[PDB]
């Protein structure tokens, strides 16, 4: 369940995770975080690379899990390019909304993952011929995660903006895709 886009993104999160253990989280935030200073305005990778940072074993394992399953689903059934666009768009909008709500010091693939949850779900309700559906197990687990975010019942501050923006994007995209 892992084509080249799914695979490179995981390797990338792994390579980044390793880089955060050697150099420490802070120094990698300085290079990959959303622009936290006017000077950084034009370091363009930053509008996407926040999606690559994970701050703990739990963070990266859960994000990579969802990603591998839904993202790898989107890849094999709908094509690599589609997963690419979903990822670029969600990563961008989730980053924007997150930073508008809580500053630039955030990271994680979960904005992307929430777009995948919303896309694989709504695409299957409106266009079940697509072959694309969020199995009810995952509908439930996706609901729970979401609720976990909004009411903040883990140990760390949740990127609530990145989540909402993420889900919005994936809906809009599956909506536009199910038109016919």
């Amino acid at each position: 369940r892992a084509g080249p886009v799914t695979w490179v993104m995981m390797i990338a999160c792994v390579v980044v995770f390793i880089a955060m253990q050697i150099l420490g989280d802070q120094e990698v935030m300085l290079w990959l975080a959303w622009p936290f200073d006017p000077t950084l305005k034009f370091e363009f990778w930053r509008y996407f690379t926040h999606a690559l940072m994970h701050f703990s074993l739990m963070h990266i394992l859960f994000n990579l899990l969802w990603w591998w399953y839904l993202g790898g689903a989107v890849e094999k059934r709908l094509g690599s390019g589609k997963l690419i666009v979903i990822t670029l768009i969600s990563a961008l909008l989730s980053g924007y909304v997150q930073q508008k709500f809580s500053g630039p010091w955030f990271g994680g693939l979960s904005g992307v993952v929430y777009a995948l949850m919303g896309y694989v779900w709504l695409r299957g309700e409106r266009d079940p011929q697509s072959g694309i559906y969020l199995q009810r197990g995952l509908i439930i687990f996706a609901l729970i995660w979401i609720v976990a975010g909004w009411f903040d019942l883990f140990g760390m501050s949740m990127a609530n903006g990145a989540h909402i923006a993420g889900l919005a994007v994936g809906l809009a995209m599956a909506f536009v895709d199910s038109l016919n």
């Binding site: 989280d25 701050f55 997150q98 809580s102 955030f106 979960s110 990127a159 990145a162």
Partner: peptide, 6 residues
């Protein structure tokens, strides 16, 4: 540090 987890 505190950072927000996405």
């Amino acid at each position: 540090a505190r950072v927000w987890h996405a």
